[PDB]
């Protein structure tokens, strides 16, 4: 009945004043993109930075299983748009936030739904 919870582990590590995960891969792009949360190609707009998905995935970076029966990773192989203000910790961001299903944007950032 035991499973390690990494999500909480990192959040508390952050709250403890720990240095966020680094060396997430930032992509060169136009920053004219659609601004959607997770995409096949960097979509960052003026307010966003675009990163390689895998490097922003906590479970990928920590070499641990992904939290779902399939063990599927919705980040790796794709690109994630992080608000430029939050870009110092892309892993923390993707962890704490949520993607709007209908408009494909980040809920709370750029989602008018």
């Amino acid at each position: 009945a035991f499973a390690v919870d990494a999500a909480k582990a990192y959040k508390d590590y952050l709250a403890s004043g720990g240095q966020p995960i680094t060396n997430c891969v930032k992509m060169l792009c136009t920053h004219t993109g659609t601004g959607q949360a997770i995409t096949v190609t960097p979509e960052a707009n003026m307010d966003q930075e675009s990163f390689g998905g895998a490097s922003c995935c906590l479970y990928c970076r920590c070499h641990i299983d992904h939290p779902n029966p399939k063990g599927f990773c919705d980040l790796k192989g794709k690109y994630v748009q992080i608000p430029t203000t939050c870009a110092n910790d892309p892993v923390g961001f993707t962890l704490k936030n949520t993607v709007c299903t209908v408009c494909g944007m980040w809920k709370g950032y750029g989602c008018s739904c």
Binding site: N23, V25, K26, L28, G52, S55, G77, A87
Partner: protein, 298 residues
């Protein structure tokens, strides 16, 4: 010079390829200088981008369901920056396989960990990329001789596993280079040594074969040609430039939908060779992609 600063990098001029030079020590004038990269951008992301920006100017077969393999994909940071750029650069739906000696996290469709010599694939490939570098190369102990190890694997992999019309980009330096790989460049419709503007202060270059013909159209001495390359680098200072990184508008690889055709080696003729050389044709099997990595038990 300095006109090139607005390019992604500089390619070795044809005239330098035709010389016969003795190998000398490479001493660069810009050694120690650094280009100013955009805020928060890694050198290797910038490097791979300019490489792709240059590749965009060549004639590359770009078939549907393109097959691309990437050697030396992992960093010491445990991620794969170069793979991410290739991923961005290549058409969506392109199969991207990458590999490295050490464990790393990748955005590639599949990743193999181990010495490249342990890697086997059933099918052939449209594009081959290698950043592999031996850390022991930094030892200046002996003189500069043709290198083996992964270089021996690459030459073999090209001859066996590269589709006709395919292209390669292989990273070399002053001391990391191989003679047969140069010789193998004459088996391509065209070839060059490309130096990125961001890394221009380094002896690093990418050997780019273009449109593999499977047989030599040109005879090349590997030792002579590498001496030619060093001579070019020695006499032509390149100004470090991050300029081309700022326009990504045209960056994505244009999808040519190049034709793929399975032919026996006897069915190949000057008309076919013509098509290959123009990057209008790929010759290989269309089957599923199956790879493996040999594991030693003891």
């Amino acid at each position: 010079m300095s006109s090139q600063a607005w390019q992604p990098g500089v390619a070795m001029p044809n005239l330098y390829k035709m010389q016969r030079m003795l190998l000398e020590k490479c001493d660069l004038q810009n050694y120690g200088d650094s280009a100013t990269l955009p805020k928060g951008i890694m050198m290797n992301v910038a490097k791979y981008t300019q490489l792709c920006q240059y590749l965009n100017t060549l004639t590359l077969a770009v078939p549907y369901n393109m097959r691309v393999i990437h050697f030396g994909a992992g960093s010491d940071k445990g991620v794969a920056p170069g793979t991410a750029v290739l991923r961005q650069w290549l058409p969506t739906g392109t199969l991207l396989v990458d590999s490295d000696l050490n464990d790393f996290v990748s955005d590639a469709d599949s990743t193999l960990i181990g010495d490249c010599a342990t890697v086997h694939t059933a099918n052939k490939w449209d594009l081959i990329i290698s950043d592999m570098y031996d850390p022991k190369t930094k030892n200046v102990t002996k003189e500069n001789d043709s290198k083996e190890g992964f270089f021996t694997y690459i030459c073999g992999f090209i001859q066996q596993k590269l589709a006709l019309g395919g292209s390669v980009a292989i990273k070399i330096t002053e001391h990391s280079w191989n003679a047969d790989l140069y010789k193998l460049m004459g088996h391509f419709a065209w070839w060059t040594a490309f130096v990125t503007n961001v890394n221009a202060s380094s002896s690093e270059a990418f050997l780019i074969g273009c449109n593999y013909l499977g047989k030599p159209r040109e005879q090349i001495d590997g030792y002579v040609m590498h001496a030619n390359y060093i001579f070019w680098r020695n006499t032509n200072p390149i100004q470090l430039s991050s300029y081309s990184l700022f326009d990504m508008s045209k960056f994505p690889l244009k999808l040519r939908g190049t034709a793929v055709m399975s032919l026996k080696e006897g069915q190949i003729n000057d008309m076919i060779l013509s098509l290959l050389s123009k990057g209008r044709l790929i010759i290989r099997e269309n089957n599923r992609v199956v790879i493996s990595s040999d594991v030693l038990v003891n």
